[PDB]
């Protein structure tokens, strides 16, 4: 449908977002995911902290380097959920994984690009209300991710700019609306109306 699809991860459930990203890649669709720190996991914060520490004790006994790597960042916690859904040791898998980018925050050019959502991974649509869940940023920070403040800062700044942008556009669509309605009731208008437009 589009050469590139930018997903705003905020309010999405990790495994369900991962599951749909993986498939799109293997079908040849490029994906970049933004705001990974705003991602969600079901279960209360403590369960998922505990689950991370579970993952944290696994290491190669003779050399901790060869052993499993533990990435603390939100985008990387995500990439793990995703990479496990791809057969990543095959040329085909490595090919699909190169179609992917994950980001905490919304860095340049993507900030001025439109982003979309995935209704089948959306927490508020998916989780039954009252169930407890977890924000990826807080989880990561508890396991050693260093950058939560820097990201939140830059975002608050980015969010101010985007607000002006929006305001100017909402104003412009107010003129366009007024003009469109002054053309209403003319011939060409009523004719389009007949044809469903």
């Amino acid at each position: 449908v589009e050469p590139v699809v930018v997903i705003d991860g905020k309010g999405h459930l990790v495994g369900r977002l991962a599951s749909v990203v993986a498939k799109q890649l293997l079908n040849g669709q490029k994906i970049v995911v933004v705001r990974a720190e705003e991602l969600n996991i079901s279960g209360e914060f403590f369960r998922n902290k505990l689950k991370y520490h579970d993952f944290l004790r696994k290491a190669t006994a003779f050399n901790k380097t060869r052993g499993p790597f533990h990435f603390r960042a939100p985008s990387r916690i995500f990439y793990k959920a995703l990479r496990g859904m791809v057969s990543h040791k095959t040329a085909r898998g490595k090919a699909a994984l190169e179609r992917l980018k994950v980001f905490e925050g919304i860095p340049p050019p993507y900030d001025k690009k439109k982003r979309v959502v995935v209704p089948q991974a959306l927490r508020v649509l998916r989780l039954k209300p009252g169930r407890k869940y977890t924000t990826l940023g807080k989880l990561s920070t508890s396991v050693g991710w260093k950058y939560e403040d820097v990201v939140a800062k830059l975002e608050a700044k980015r969010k101010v700019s985007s607000a002006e942008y929006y305001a100017k556009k909402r104003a412009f669509t107010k003129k366009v609306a007024s003009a469109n309605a002054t053309a209403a009731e003319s011939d060409v208008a009523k004719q389009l109306a007949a044809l469903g437009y």
């Binding site: 003129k175 366009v176 003009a179 469109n180 002054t182 053309a183 060409v188 208008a189 004719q191 389009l192 044809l195 469903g196 437009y197």
Partner: protein
């Protein structure tokens, strides 16, 4: 300084609530809630729309803003009478909802020629509007 507590005013499942049936052999037809069975199940009757009096899952149906006076458990003859009395069809047809639906049905029926004509007209409408947009 008054109190001021919100609204959050929902569509209610109630006798005489009219619903748009979203999937089935009826599907796009309006009907009315007669009795109510449980939290997920109600009895509906659609006589004007040609939909058979039946038990149905709430999830197969979407609640509209429209309501009209109906006796709980009112039979089909009665329902048909109260419906017309209340003029719910013209009321629905007048809604943006219904209009949006009819609109896209028109679009789908378009002939390839008609599509071409829609294009020449948008060209024309665009010319004068963009004009007006530059003068104010």
């Amino acid at each position: 300084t008054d109190s001021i507590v919100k609204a959050s005013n929902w569509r209610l499942v109630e006798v005489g609530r009219v619903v748009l049936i979203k999937k089935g052999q009826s599907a796009g037809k309006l009907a009315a809630i007669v009795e109510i069975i449980d939290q997920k199940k109600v009895l509906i009757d659609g006589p004007k729309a040609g939909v058979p009096r039946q038990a149905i899952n709430l999830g197969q149906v979407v609640l509209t803003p429209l309501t009209f006076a109906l006796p709980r458990g009112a039979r089909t003859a009665t329902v048909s009478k109260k419906w017309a009395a209340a003029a719910v069809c013209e009321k629905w047809a007048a809604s943006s909802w219904a209009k949006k639906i009819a609109q896209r049905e028109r679009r789908a029926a378009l002939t390839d020629f008609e599509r071409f004509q829609v294009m020449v007209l948008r060209k024309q409408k665009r010319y004068t509007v963009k004009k007006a947009l530059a003068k104010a």
